[PDB]
């Protein structure tokens, strides 16, 4: 019919726009600045690099850790980074100067994961030492050490008002903690206990997205303690791969994979809607831009690059 | 890195 029309898309169309080269070892983590201007990457090369979020242009390198870095995170005002290193420290960095403002000492094994709270007066960290620590940004002092888990802590994240922390561990547990007291409010267990390799709150703080080392991502209503959605089809049995909620266009779940692809699922239907091809190693980290339909992905030692992908929806 | 193997 002459009246036939192009249907509204139900899948995104992310396509490769830039490849960001510069790290000399595996990339561990990429994060967009909350103001949308920048991407920060961390690496096994002991460096943090800053890149333009829209143009992919290298901006600067931030150096000082003695061993490789597993995670980096931005303050709410996009002025600070925190990094988590095998050197058993975190460092707080002034992005504009590249100077280390504070070194957060106390963990007794690799620091693996870190995040600021929304207010950005606190940092939470998780370590191979099985603890979660909460740190004062201003003084760099450890405020609390939580006996969080019985195996390495893979992820830590504050909810949207900073009142809760979620943590995950190789022990197979996800725990929710009260920030102000450090008391455990909930432990999510189910059927089994495969290592939980990643967790974060949904942007509305009502769900948690959790990855397990059995090739599965799950969306949990933690208040009810019930699994609402399961996402499969990717490969994830070995590495602590980040996952994300994409909320700028269609509502997707995004994750890396051990088959060197970025997977995108429809959050509601659980259908794989795109697989992004081009990396030549495990895609360890993905991040979604806060306002534009842009994904950053980063890969391990056979690749060492960051890719920026852009979609119309 | 610990995360990269």
Question: What does A275-286 look like in DSSP terms, one character per residue?
Answer: EE---SS-EEEE
Residues of B in contact with A25 (CB under 8 A): 4
Work out the widest C-alpha separation in chain B, in whole angstroms: 7
Beta bridge partners of A283: A299
**Helix, strand or coil, per DSSP, at residue A306:** strand
A301 vs B: CB within 8 A: yes
User: What's this structure's resolution in Å?
Assistant: 1.6
Residues of B in contact with A71 (CB under 8 A): 3
Residues of B in contact with A68 (CB under 8 A): 2, 4
Select from A128, A152, A300 the Cβ nearest to the Cβ of B4: A300
Please say whether the beta carbons of A93 and A103 come within 8 A: no
- Residue written as token pair 């791969």: A241
A166 vs B: CB within 8 A: no
The Cα–Cα gap between A112 and A169 comes to 11
Write out the two tokens for A274: 């795109």
- A184-188 vs A196-201, strand pairing mode: unpaired
Restricting to A residues 272-291, those with a Cβ less than 8 Å away from any Cβ of B are 284
A86 vs B: CB within 8 A: yes
Query: Residue A150, Cβ neighbours under 10 Å: how many?
Result: 11
Which residue in A15, A58, A26, A22 sits closest to A39, CA to CA? A58
Opening angle at CA A277, ends B2 and A273, nearest 5: 100
Give the number of C-alpha atoms closer than 13 A to the C-alpha of residue A41, restricted to the C-beta side: 37
The Cα–Cα gap between A176 and A156 comes to 10
Restricting to B residues 1-5, those with a Cβ less than 8 Å away from any Cβ of A are 2-5
Burial letters A36-63, b for 16+ CB under 10 A, else e: eebbbbbbbbbbbbbbebbebeeeeebe
Q: How far is CA A245 from CA A11, A50, A145, A191, A289, in A?
A: 15, 22, 29, 25, 10
Torsions phi, psi for A305 (to 5 deg): -110, 165
A44 vs B: CB within 8 A: yes
DSSP type of residue A209? E
Method: X-ray
* Sign of the dihedral defined by the CA atoms of residues A63, A78, A121, A68, in that order: negative
Contact state of A284 with B2 under an 8 Å Cβ cutoff: no
Which residue in A190, A192, A196 sits closest to A126, CA to CA? A196
Residues of B in contact with A112 (CB under 8 A): 2-3
Compute the nearest-CA separation of A87 from chain B (Å).
9
Which residue in A263, A303, A293 sits closest to A53, CA to CA? A293
The Cα–Cα gap between A229 and A246 comes to 16
Torsions phi, psi for A270 (to 5 deg): 75, 5
Select from A27, A110, A300 the Cβ nearest to the Cβ of B5: A300
Contact state of A284 with B3 under an 8 Å Cβ cutoff: yes
Contact state of B4 with A28 under an 8 Å Cβ cutoff: yes
Beta bridge partners of A105: A89
Please say whether the beta carbons of A216 and A229 come within 8 A: no
Please say whether the beta carbons of A82 and A51 come within 8 A: no
Which residue in A290, A296, A285 sits closest to A33, CA to CA? A290
- Residue written as token pair 């980096």: A72
């Amino acid at each position: 019919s002459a009246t036939q029309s192009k249907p509204t898309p139900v899948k995104p169309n992310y396509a490769l726009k830039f490849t960001l080269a510069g790290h000399t070892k595996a990339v561990s983590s990429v994060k967009f600045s909350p103001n949308g201007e920048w991407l920060a990457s961390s690496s096994a090369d002991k460096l943090i690099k800053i890149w333009g979020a829209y143009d992919g242009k290298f901006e600067k390198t931030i150096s000082g850790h003695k061993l490789g870095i597993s995670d980096v995170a931005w303050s709410s005002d996009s002025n600070l980074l925190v990094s988590a290193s095998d050197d058993k420290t975190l460092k707080i960095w002034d992005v504009s100067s590249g100077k280390c403002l504070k070194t957060l000492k106390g963990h007794s094994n690799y620091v693996f994961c870190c995040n600021f709270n929304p207010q950005s007066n606190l940092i939470v960290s998780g370590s191979f030492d099985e603890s979660v620590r909460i740190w004062d940004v201003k003084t760099g002092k450890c405020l609390k050490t939580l006996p969080a888990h019985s195996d390495p802590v893979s992820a830590v994240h504050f909810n949207r008002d900073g009142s809760l922390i979620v943590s995950s561990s190789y022990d197979g547990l996800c725990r929710i903690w009260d920030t102000a007291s450090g008391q455990c409010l909930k432990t999510l267990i189910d059927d089994d206990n495969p290592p939980v390799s990643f967790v974060k709150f949904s942007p509305n703080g009502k769900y948690i997205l959790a990855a397990t080392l059995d090739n599965t991502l799950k969306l949990w209503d933690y208040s009810k303690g019930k699994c609402l959605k399961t996402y499969t089809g990717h490969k994830n049995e070995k590495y602590c791969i980040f996952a994300n909620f994409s909320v700028t266009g269609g509502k997707w779940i995004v994750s890396g994979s051990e088959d060197n692809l970025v997977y995108i699922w429809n959050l509601q239907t659980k259908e794989i809607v795109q697989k992004l091809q081009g990396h030549t190693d495990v895609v360890i980290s993905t991040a979604c831009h806060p306002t534009e339909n842009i994904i950053a992905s980063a890969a391990l030692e056979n690749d060492k690059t960051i890719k920026l992908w852009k979609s119309d929806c | 890195x610990x995360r990269a193997x």
